[PDB]
Symmetry: C2
Subunit: 109 residues, 2 copies
């Protein structure tokens, strides 16, 4: 099941579309990997538990910049902007990014 | 193990909307894939307008107003790829907003 695409389609349907997602893929980090990343300075040294790898499309440069910034201003998120490309056939930018979320979420167990 | 449904809700709530606002906030978003049998039974039962669903998202959320909740529900009815089953909503008089629950079905497309 192409989960990443279903999750993207579901997120794009939520009414507000300047930034649409193509794929949203989640993984949990080992404590060792989280340790390495915090020390490497990625995600501003926050202790990330979960990473969402994103591929998306932005109708303008400025919409992409707002999207990236939203994940920089929170104590619970970090973002690594991996890249963007102009798509002249569709008049938009494709882009990729990894969003880290700090550990400590609780669930029943 | 990892409470994915909370990390995904938080990620979705972080995606910026115009004005910095969030008229619907998600608290839990769980996904699951349907066996062919279950999709066949749901379709015959008329759930999700008889579309044959491939993935189902179970949602717990909060809506700023009755009108925000109605817009959220309708977003998932006006698309050929989605159906929604609205389970319920309640006014939280401590906060002056609505909690709600719903299931969203997604087609193979
Ligand atoms: Mg709720």
């Amino acid at each position: 099941v192409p989960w990443s695409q279903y999750l993207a389609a579901f997120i794009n349907q939520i009414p507000r579309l300047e930034v649409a997602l193509r794929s949203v893929s989640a993984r949990a980090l080992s404590e060792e990997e989280a340790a390495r990343l915090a020390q490497e300075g990625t995600y501003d040294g926050k202790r990330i538990r979960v990473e969402f790898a994103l591929q998306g499309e932005a109708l303008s440069r400025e919409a992409l910049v707002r999207f990236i910034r939203a994940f920089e201003t929170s104590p619970r998120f970090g973002i690594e902007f991996q890249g963007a490309s102009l798509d002249e056939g569709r008049g938009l930018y494709t882009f990729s990014a990894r969003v880290g979320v700090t550990g400590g979420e609780s669930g029943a167990r």
